[PDB]
Design a protein around this motif. Structure first.
Motif, PDB file in Angstrom:
ATOM      1  N   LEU A   1       0.826  -1.199   0.000  1.00  0.00           N
ATOM      2  CA  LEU A   1       0.000   0.000   0.000  1.00  0.00           C
ATOM      3  C   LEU A   1       0.864   1.253   0.000  1.00  0.00           C
ATOM      4  CD1 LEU A   1      -2.287  -1.682   2.474  1.00  0.00           C
ATOM      5  CD2 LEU A   1      -3.398  -0.173   0.813  1.00  0.00           C
ATOM      6  N   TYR A   2       0.392   2.278  -0.704  1.00  0.00           N
ATOM      7  CA  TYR A   2       1.010   3.595  -0.723  1.00  0.00           C
ATOM      8  C   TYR A   2      -0.021   4.629  -0.298  1.00  0.00           C
ATOM      9  CZ  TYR A   2       5.191   1.865  -3.108  1.00  0.00           C
ATOM     10  OH  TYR A   2       6.354   1.202  -3.426  1.00  0.00           O
ATOM     11  N   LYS A   3       0.410   5.579   0.532  1.00  0.00           N
ATOM     12  CA  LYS A   3      -0.442   6.610   1.122  1.00  0.00           C
ATOM     13  C   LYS A   3      -1.540   6.033   2.008  1.00  0.00           C
ATOM     14  CE  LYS A   3       0.869  10.764  -0.669  1.00  0.00           C
ATOM     15  NZ  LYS A   3       0.945  12.073   0.037  1.00  0.00           N
TER      16      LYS A   3
ATOM     17  N   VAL B   1      -4.067   4.182   1.224  1.00  0.00           N
ATOM     18  CA  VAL B   1      -5.314   3.867   0.533  1.00  0.00           C
ATOM     19  C   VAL B   1      -5.050   3.221  -0.822  1.00  0.00           C
ATOM     20  CG1 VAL B   1      -6.829   5.490   1.708  1.00  0.00           C
ATOM     21  CG2 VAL B   1      -5.362   6.287  -0.154  1.00  0.00           C
ATOM     22  N   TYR B   2      -3.975   3.628  -1.494  1.00  0.00           N
ATOM     23  CA  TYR B   2      -3.674   3.141  -2.835  1.00  0.00           C
ATOM     24  C   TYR B   2      -2.881   1.841  -2.753  1.00  0.00           C
ATOM     25  CZ  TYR B   2      -4.903   7.996  -3.771  1.00  0.00           C
ATOM     26  OH  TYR B   2      -5.548   9.212  -3.819  1.00  0.00           O
ATOM     27  N   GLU B   3      -3.385   0.803  -3.416  1.00  0.00           N
ATOM     28  CA  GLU B   3      -2.757  -0.512  -3.452  1.00  0.00           C
ATOM     29  C   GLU B   3      -2.115  -0.732  -4.816  1.00  0.00           C
ATOM     30  OE1 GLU B   3      -4.944  -4.129  -1.843  1.00  0.00           O
ATOM     31  OE2 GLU B   3      -4.409  -4.863  -3.842  1.00  0.00           O
TER      32      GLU B   3
END
Ligand SMILES: *[C@@H]1O[C@H](CO)[C@@H](O[C@@H]2O[C@H](CO)[C@@H](O[C@@H]3O[C@H](CO)[C@@H](O)[C@H](O[C@H]4O[C@H](CO)[C@@H](O)[C@H](O)[C@@H]4O[C@H]4O[C@H](CO)[C@@H](O)[C@H](O)[C@@H]4O)[C@@H]3O)[C@H](O)[C@H]2NC(C)=O)[C@H](O)[C@H]1NC(C)=O
Ligand SMILES: *[C@@H]1O[C@H](CO)[C@@H](O[C@@H]2O[C@H](CO)[C@@H](O[C@@H]3O[C@H](CO[C@H]4O[C@H](CO)[C@@H](O)[C@H](O)[C@@H]4O)[C@@H](O)[C@H](O[C@H]4O[C@H](CO)[C@@H](O)[C@H](O)[C@@H]4O)[C@@H]3O)[C@H](O)[C@H]2NC(C)=O)[C@H](O)[C@H]1NC(C)=O
Ligand SMILES: *[C@@H]1O[C@H](CO)[C@@H](O[C@@H]2O[C@H](CO)[C@@H](O[C@@H]3O[C@H](CO)[C@@H](O)[C@H](O[C@H]4O[C@H](CO)[C@@H](O)[C@H](O)[C@@H]4O)[C@@H]3O)[C@H](O)[C@H]2NC(C)=O)[C@H](O)[C@H]1NC(C)=O
Ligand SMILES: *[C@@H]1O[C@H](CO)[C@@H](O[C@@H]2O[C@H](CO)[C@@H](O[C@@H]3O[C@H](CO)[C@@H](O)[C@H](O[C@H]4O[C@H](CO)[C@@H](O)[C@H](O)[C@@H]4O)[C@@H]3O)[C@H](O)[C@H]2NC(C)=O)[C@H](O)[C@H]1NC(C)=O
Ligand SMILES: *[C@@H]1O[C@H](CO)[C@@H](O[C@@H]2O[C@H](CO)[C@@H](O[C@@H]3O[C@H](CO)[C@@H](O)[C@H](O)[C@@H]3O)[C@H](O)[C@H]2NC(C)=O)[C@H](O)[C@H]1NC(C)=O
Ligand SMILES: *[C@@H]1O[C@H](CO)[C@@H](O[C@@H]2O[C@H](CO)[C@@H](O[C@@H]3O[C@H](CO)[C@@H](O)[C@H](O)[C@@H]3O)[C@H](O)[C@H]2NC(C)=O)[C@H](O)[C@H]1NC(C)=O
Ligand SMILES: *[C@@H]1O[C@H](CO[C@@H]2O[C@@H](C)[C@@H](O)[C@@H](O)[C@@H]2O)[C@@H](O[C@@H]2O[C@H](CO)[C@@H](O)[C@H](O)[C@H]2NC(C)=O)[C@H](O)[C@H]1NC(C)=O
Ligand SMILES: *[C@@H]1O[C@H](CO)[C@@H](O[C@@H]2O[C@H](CO)[C@@H](O)[C@H](O)[C@H]2NC(C)=O)[C@H](O)[C@H]1NC(C)=O
Ligand SMILES: *[C@@H]1O[C@H](CO)[C@@H](O[C@@H]2O[C@H](CO)[C@@H](O)[C@H](O)[C@H]2NC(C)=O)[C@H](O)[C@H]1NC(C)=O
Ligand SMILES: *[C@@H]1O[C@H](CO)[C@@H](O[C@@H]2O[C@H](CO)[C@@H](O)[C@H](O)[C@H]2NC(C)=O)[C@H](O)[C@H]1NC(C)=O
Ligand SMILES: *[C@@H]1O[C@H](CO)[C@@H](O[C@@H]2O[C@H](CO)[C@@H](O)[C@H](O)[C@H]2NC(C)=O)[C@H](O)[C@H]1NC(C)=O
Ligand SMILES: *[C@@H]1O[C@H](CO)[C@@H](O[C@@H]2O[C@H](CO)[C@@H](O)[C@H](O)[C@H]2NC(C)=O)[C@H](O)[C@H]1NC(C)=O
Ligand SMILES: *[C@@H]1O[C@H](CO)[C@@H](O)[C@H](O)[C@H]1NC(C)=O
Ligand SMILES: *[C@@H]1O[C@H](CO)[C@@H](O)[C@H](O)[C@H]1NC(C)=O
Ligand SMILES: *[C@@H]1O[C@H](CO)[C@@H](O)[C@H](O)[C@H]1NC(C)=O
Ligand SMILES: *[C@@H]1O[C@H](CO)[C@@H](O)[C@H](O)[C@H]1NC(C)=O
Ligand SMILES: *[C@@H]1O[C@H](CO)[C@@H](O)[C@H](O)[C@H]1NC(C)=O
Ligand SMILES: *[C@@H]1O[C@H](CO)[C@@H](O)[C@H](O)[C@H]1NC(C)=O
Ligand SMILES: *[C@@H]1O[C@H](CO)[C@@H](O)[C@H](O)[C@H]1NC(C)=O
Lengths: 188, 153, 218, 212, 181, 145, 152
Positions: free
Chosen positions: A3-5, A7-9
């Motif tokens: 995951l990044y941030k 929420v973003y996968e």
């Protein structure tokens, strides 16, 4: 997975170029010596690199072959684009063919840096964009000095079989050479 | 290039594109939003967009035409579908032993809840091996930072 | 100028915890990824941890470090942090913080490095040394200064009269957390009889002064 | 343990061309073309001398060149100058970690003839053994260039645990000296037949053995 | 020097194309009669316009020259693109004996125009000094010189009239093989 | 189009320029190079970068290399444009000289546009003054946002 | 392409009554023609560069002129834009034969959009109904431009 941030996968995808077989040709690689260019789901072309030669002629009769349309114009086009893409092609005696009975077969004698052997391997490297690098040992860092141990490069017509083991098929190879055609030849 | 791609009869929104289960290898069908695919007509520097126009042209040519083997057709629309110099760029990167794109694998950021995805950028390869996530992590960071700004507008 | 500066190095007990910082000066902190590379005082460089640019979503640690160290960053505050826990004696090294960019298109190497901060791990307290004699056309003899803390110790021979051939080696931090060194002198084999050799070890932090006479083996 | 194997030291006369080899595995050096070389002078931080195998940062002398062949990278310093005498490290991308560094190599600009070390192995003292302790002191002195690699043996069996060695320190005669210690219990001392100290200097090894 | 809006100052810069000598060829001009295309820092090609002719042959043996690779493929490439770029080519003599490459062109809407037309783009730097009626004329460009000879020469600092630049050679790569019968 | 990719700013070394010191340009300026397709200065940056990049990453024996990347670096039709202007006796760009607006205090510069030449003589500042005016007026709008 | 073409304002373009068939002269604003240099997929812009180059060659040169166009073709028009229309015709999709165009003219202001091509299918121009939604997005974009101008 990753995951990044918060929420973003991160996700991936791999395209299956085999779908494009009907509209455009697809280039792939089997092993170090054999590479293929599939034009349809029946016919195709085989790029082989072997010390063993097949053609013993020193002359390539195209005009005689052009009268008899026994060959496949599609396969004859993709081999025509190959020869034009070869840069600094001067000596034709290293090029030999045999189009008897529609069976197209061309052989390049590589026994003759900045030589005719490089231009052939240079065009071949781009054509089989998938897995050409396995063929050349000094590929990385060499442009005009690419060389091999094999003595002959033979291109024959073959039937479609599932032999794209080393690299998946893709048209990007053939696509790149269309612009390069007829752009690095001398005057006859 | 000049090819305009559009998924006719597409349910969700007009202008988006879906890649069928046959277009992908060992994967189910995947759809991408308008905001992502709209960059394909704008930018000239995306490899994934060039593949969409090839897959769309291949699909479009199949349903609307009669196959006789149809090699002349592509030999004329090549420059109108893909960016030829984008192929040259990747070849130059391979010749200089820089990680290049062999147009097979791509990566994108999918929102766990919203579902908005970025335009999938190509997964570069070096010595026949795809780069690890670490070696281009900062590329994902700018994509995630850009994913926010686009949703904000 | 583009700079990076560390802070927080010092003495810490074995099993304790320590906090390091790394500040940027003259560049856009957020765009780059930062690393932590420690260098053992007498050995090569070793990579420890890494933090991705912008949001620190991608974190990496070394197997010899995993679970004990925790990296963090604050783009607005322009500070890179590394939290040390369960510190072992072998963690004593000079810790650097360096930048780079992990991009597939435009990558950046470890171009900018900090001056480095020295971290020492030892739970031992102030202890005096234990001098032992290294009994011998020339022969070598010396003194073994073992198990002392902290630094330093000064060694002279014959109260500074003997200088020729004398060499005092740097200290060595052992696994126990106590320094040790040797001071030797090469003298003619014939002189071993007539001449008297005494080393004068001085450990001011413990208020200790030992004089050991080195006699040949019986 | 250092991930990338680097030589102990490479030396050359002023104006010569020397090369440092950075050997790695297939997962790091061979996998990618991101190999970097760093120059570290005493007291200073590592200075990036070469990145991406052969690319040189702006401000670095054109005398430094990089190479690679399979799993080994090579840093070549042509036209040696006194200012080049420093420690050099190599790093590369890896499949397991972002960066993997090498052991390091000391480049010495030969300003005096090469000198072989003078090894002197000392057995544990009588006073030390009475304190239930035993230390083997291996004294390396009068060698040039200043870089050695010691190895301990116990009845021809290599010993690694409980070994501590100093870095070569300059002597009064501009030559270098190093010290190595093998700490063990008095039971271990009298157990084995003999203990050896193998000192390797510029490819030539000197060995001294002692027995209880 | 000169300010706009009170804060913005007008400044200039001039590029030194000589840096690109290793990667690409560079075309420059010495005087009215002599023009050059330098490939690298050792070899090069000279474009001269003189009433005096050098080659008296009527045939250009290419097949024989291709068998003996004595010539430099780089110089042979930049001379091959020249001939291919000549429009409406339907007077050409050569001499490649011993690797020394040398081509001579015996000089509206004629073959003399196409040669000067390609030559004008080739020496993009200072070709205009050669033609007297260059401005306002495209198909009717003409000179007083009778022959255009291209020989191989060694590099010497003779780019006096115009600085070298690759833009000339680069433009002809697209025009190649696009105006022949 | 072209695709060569040349953090993000570019500096021209003292060797890249003639009788001048090294000059650097901001990110906002060079960012226009990837956007616009009709700028000669950007084509030169990709030529200087490709020449620089090829040298350090390759071993010269190298004419075949450029003959393939030409279209991927420069705009071929931009060369044709200037040739048409020369043929019609319009002031054209011979790719040598450029002009830009440098802020006396801020230091922000515009993307240097080509200095046109007519009959082997560069145009005076007066003959293209209104071109500088529109550039300075556009420079403000960028600085505002 | 790279050709830069150029009464009331500099940079705009007017088509004389000789350039049009059975119509008077028509002028287009700066905001419209500025998009020609920006976008790469507009047929009307390719025609403007052809008419301007044709005009420029006549007045600035002395005719003896096929070689001239054979060199500037790629510098004036988008060749692949012609290929696009050929592919559309080959697939019997409504394509642009470069003759007719349509634009939105403000009744009072006079500001017009960049005229998009009027597609044809089997030798018959499409009715207004069959591409009405194309005009809607054009009218919706025309508003945003008026706001974008008055907002600044
Ligand atoms: C871009 O770069 C990447 C990385 O270099 C390239 O990726 C590699 O692609 C090859 C080709 O697919 C792939 O090799 C496969 O490995 C699999 C194991 O991991 C094999 O199972 C597979 O073989 C099957 O497919 C072949 C081709 O169809 C068949 O000939 C073969 O018989 C195998 O078929 C299976 O299924 C049939 C039907 O059930 C059965 O009869 C068989 O017995 C068999 O069970 C390939 O050998 C590599 O693993 C890829 N590498 C990576 C790192 O992913 C990619 O190709 C490049 N793209 C381009 C366009 O060149
Ligand atoms: C970003 O991430 C999100 C979430 O992870 C993804 O969204 C999911 O996408 C998948 C695939 O598109 C969705 O799955 C599918 O739903 C379809 C519609 O569902 C019907 O069936 C269910 C059955 O319970 C009913 O309840 C419902 O009312 C509908 O009637 C199905 O038709 C699909 O099935 C097919 O595949 C399965 C295998 O997966 C087969 O077994 C079936 O036979 C059939 O062939 C599929 O199940 C899923 O619902 C989405 N979830 C959410 C939360 O959105 C995004 O796709 C992803 N983005 C990208 C670009 O990858
Ligand atoms: C673009 O157009 C401009 C203007 O037409 C054009 O510029 C001219 O370049 C030439 C070549 O450098 C200049 O001529 C020089 O003049 C100076 C004195 O001012 C001389 O010192 C120069 O001679 C030296 O350099 C020679 C070449 O290396 C040596 O052979 C010689 O021995 C000297 O060392 C040289 O004669 C000329 O002044 C400018 N003109 C202007 C107005 O600036 C430019 O070349 C064009 N670009 C291209 C790529 O053609
Ligand atoms: C290469 O050879 C060619 C052909 O031989 C040669 O060209 C010739 O140049 C001369 C001089 O420029 C030309 O002669 C002129 O002809 C025009 C009519 O066409 C006359 O009007 C000219 O007269 C004026 O000038 C005279 C002095 O030269 C005065 O005496 C007179 O009163 C007039 O004022 C002049 O006679 C000749 O026409 C061309 N020939 C051709 C076929 O064009 C060229 O110069 C040679 N080049 C070199 C470098 O040797
Ligand atoms: C060459 O390209 C064609 C077209 O891209 C490939 O054909 C496709 O083959 C698949 C699998 O046989 C077909 O999928 C099928 O879909 C139907 C629904 O229509 C469904 O009943 C099944 O899922 C079935 O498998 C697909 O329709 C077909 N496409 C077309 C246009 O005919 C072909 O396989 C390629 N050749 C090779 C050798 O890969
Ligand atoms: C052909 O192109 C090459 C490369 O662009 C030109 O070589 C360059 O020459 C200059 C001057 O000799 C070199 O500059 C120098 O920089 C070093 C620092 O590295 C410094 O000590 C001096 O300032 C020195 O002059 C430059 O490094 C060099 N570039 C390369 C890549 O080797 C060459 O001059 C061109 N040929 C001609 C005829 O101009
Ligand atoms: C670095 O990557 C390797 C391999 O990546 C796999 O292969 C690539 C070509 C690409 O397709 C990636 O998406 C793949 O994940 C990682 O090793 C693999 O780890 C996974 C999960 O632990 C495992 O399932 C695979 O079998 C492993 N394959 C191999 C060859 O080892 C590795 O973990 C990555 N390293 C880091 C730090 O992320
Ligand atoms: C690559 O694979 C091909 C196909 O499996 C191999 O081909 C054949 O080679 C053997 C031995 O020379 C012959 O007996 C077969 O008749 C060949 N088949 C065909 C269709 O030509 C090839 O040898 C392999 N090469 C390498 C280097 O592995
Ligand atoms: C094809 O023939 C060439 C030449 O006989 C072979 O190349 C030789 O390989 C050996 C072993 O690597 C070298 O010792 C020789 O020096 C090579 N010869 C030359 C001229 O380079 C090559 O191995 C053969 N290939 C196959 C597949 O048989
Ligand atoms: C242009 O310059 C060249 C070289 O400086 C001149 O050529 C020389 O001319 C003299 C006199 O004819 C000869 O003796 C030399 O041998 C020539 N040199 C070469 C290399 O050919 C040329 O005459 C000049 N032309 C003009 C019009 O000024
Ligand atoms: C714009 O003008 C400024 C000031 O004149 C230039 O900045 C100077 O650059 C030189 C060389 O890089 C330095 O030695 C000075 O210290 C700088 N001064 C200041 C105040 O910054 C700047 O280089 C100019 N920009 C361009 C593109 O030429
Ligand atoms: C848009 O509509 C206006 C009004 O109908 C047109 O303007 C007229 O143009 C004619 C010919 O140029 C003049 O004689 C009239 O005086 C104009 N009237 C007004 C009120 O301006 C305008 O030409 C139209 N625009 C286009 C592109 O056709
Ligand atoms: C190739 O595809 C066509 C159409 O899908 C099909 O009729 C034909 O049988 C296929 N040939 C083979 C050998 O699969
Ligand atoms: C090539 O084509 C000929 C004629 O169609 C055929 O006889 C021959 O078998 C083909 N080659 C292969 C390998 O099948
Ligand atoms: C290839 O060339 C070599 C060297 O000229 C020659 O010995 C050999 O016979 C040639 N082979 C063929 C098939 O022409
Ligand atoms: C890629 O790198 C490996 C690493 O050792 C090397 O063995 C191999 O020859 C390289 N090239 C190919 C084509 O595998
Ligand atoms: C050409 O350049 C190379 C490398 O810079 C140099 O070694 C050689 O001496 C140069 N040749 C000439 C004639 O200047
Ligand atoms: C050039 O052509 C002219 C006219 O045909 C002729 O008189 C002259 O001899 C020719 N010169 C050469 C070198 O062929
Ligand atoms: C051209 O090349 C040949 C052969 O390499 C050489 O003899 C001749 O001198 C060269 N020409 C010049 C002007 O140097």
């Amino acid at each position: 997975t990753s995951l990044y941030k918060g929420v973003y996968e991160l996700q991936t995808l791999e395209l299956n170029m085999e779908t494009l077989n009907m509209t455009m040709p697809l280039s792939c690689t089997k092993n170090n010596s054999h590479h293929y260019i599939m034009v349809g789901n029946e016919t195709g072309l085989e790029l082989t690199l072997t010390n063993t030669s097949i053609i013993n002629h020193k002359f390539c009769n195209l005009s005689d072959a052009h009268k008899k349309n026994l060959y496949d114009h599609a396969l004859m086009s993709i081999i025509s684009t190959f020869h034009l893409s070869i840069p600094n092609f001067n000596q034709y005696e290293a090029m030999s063919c045999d189009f008897n009975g529609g069976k197209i077969s061309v052989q390049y004698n590589l026994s003759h840096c900045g030589t005719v052997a490089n231009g052939v391997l240079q065009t071949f490297m781009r054509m089989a964009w998938g897995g050409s690098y396995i063929a050349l040992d000094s590929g990385c860092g060499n442009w005009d000095c690419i060389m091999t141990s094999y003595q002959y490069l033979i291109i024959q017509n073959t039937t479609w079989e599932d032999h794209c083991q080393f690299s998946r098929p893709s048209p990007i190879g053939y696509l790149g050479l269309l612009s390069q055609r007829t752009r690095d030849i001398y005057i006859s | 290039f000049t090819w305009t791609l559009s998924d006719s009869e597409g349910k969700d929104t007009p202008g988006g594109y879906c890649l069928t289960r046959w277009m992908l290898i060992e994967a189910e069908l995947k759809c991408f939003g308008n905001t992502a695919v709209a960059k394909c007509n704008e930018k000239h520097d995306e490899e994934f967009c060039d593949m969409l126009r090839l897959f769309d042209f291949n699909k479009q040519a199949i349903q609307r035409l009669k196959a006789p083997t149809s090699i002349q057709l592509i030999n004329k629309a090549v420059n109108a579908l893909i960016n030829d110099q984008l192929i040259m760029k990747n070849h130059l990167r391979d010749i200089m032993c820089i990680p290049y794109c062999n147009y097979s694998k791509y990566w994108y950021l999918n929102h766990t809840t919203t579902g908005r995805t970025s335009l999938p950028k190509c997964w570069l390869v070096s010595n026949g091996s795809y780069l690890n996530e670490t070696h281009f992590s900062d590329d994902i960071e700018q994509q995630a930072d850009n994913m926010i700004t686009e949703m904000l507008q | 100028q583009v700079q990076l500066q560390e802070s927080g190095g010092g003495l810490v007990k074995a099993g304790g915890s320590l906090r390091l910082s790394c500040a940027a000066s003259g560049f856009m902190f957020e765009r780059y990824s930062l690393h932590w590379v420690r260098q053992t005082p007498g050995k090569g460089l070793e990579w420890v941890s890494s933090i991705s640019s912008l949001s620190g979503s991608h974190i990496n640690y070394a197997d010899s470090v995993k679970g004990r160290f925790t990296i963090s960053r604050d783009n607005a505050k322009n500070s890179l942090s590394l939290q040390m826990n369960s510190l072992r004696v072998e963690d004593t090294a000079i810790y650097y913080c360096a930048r780079d960019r992990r991009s597939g298109s435009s990558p950046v190497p470890l171009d900018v490095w900090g001056q480095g901060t020295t971290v020492t791990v030892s739970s031992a307290s102030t202890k005096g040394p234990s001098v032992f004699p290294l009994a011998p056309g020339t022969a070598a003899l010396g003194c073994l200064v073992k198990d002392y803390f902290p630094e330093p110790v000064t060694v002279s021979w014959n109260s500074g009269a003997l200088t020729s051939g004398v060499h005092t080696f740097p200290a060595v931090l052992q696994s126990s957390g106590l320094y040790s060194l040797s001071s030797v002198v090469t003298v003619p084999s014939s002189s071993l009889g007539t001449q008297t050799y005494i080393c004068n070890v001085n450990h001011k932090p413990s208020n200790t002064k030992v004089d050991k006479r080195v006699e040949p083996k019986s | 343990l250092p991930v990338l194997t680097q030589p102990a030291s490479v030396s050359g006369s002023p104006g010569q061309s020397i090369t440092i080899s950075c050997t790695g595995t297939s997962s790091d050096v061979g996998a990618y073309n991101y190999v970097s070389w760093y120059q570290q002078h005493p007291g200073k931080a590592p200075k990036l001398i070469i990145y991406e195998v052969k690319i040189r940062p702006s401000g670095v002398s054109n005398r430094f060149s990089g190479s690679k062949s399979g799993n080994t990278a090579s840093l070549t310093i042509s036209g040696l100058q006194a200012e080049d005498e420093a420690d050099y490290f190599c790093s590369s991308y890896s499949t397991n970690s972002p960066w993997v560094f090498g052991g390091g190599t000391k480049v010495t600009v030969l300003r005096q003839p090469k000198a072989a070390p003078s090894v002197t192995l000392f057995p544990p003292s009588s006073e030390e053994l009475q304190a239930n302790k035993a230390t083997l002191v291996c004294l390396i002195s009068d060698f040039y260039p200043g870089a050695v690699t010691v190895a301990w043996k116990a009845d021809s069996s290599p010993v690694k645990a409980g070994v501590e060695t100093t870095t070569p320190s300059k002597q009064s005669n501009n030559k270098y000296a190093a010290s190595s210690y093998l700490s063990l219990t008095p039971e271990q001392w009298k157990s084995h037949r003999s203990y050896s100290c193998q000192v390797t200097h510029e490819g030539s090894t000197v060995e001294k053995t002692v027995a209880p």
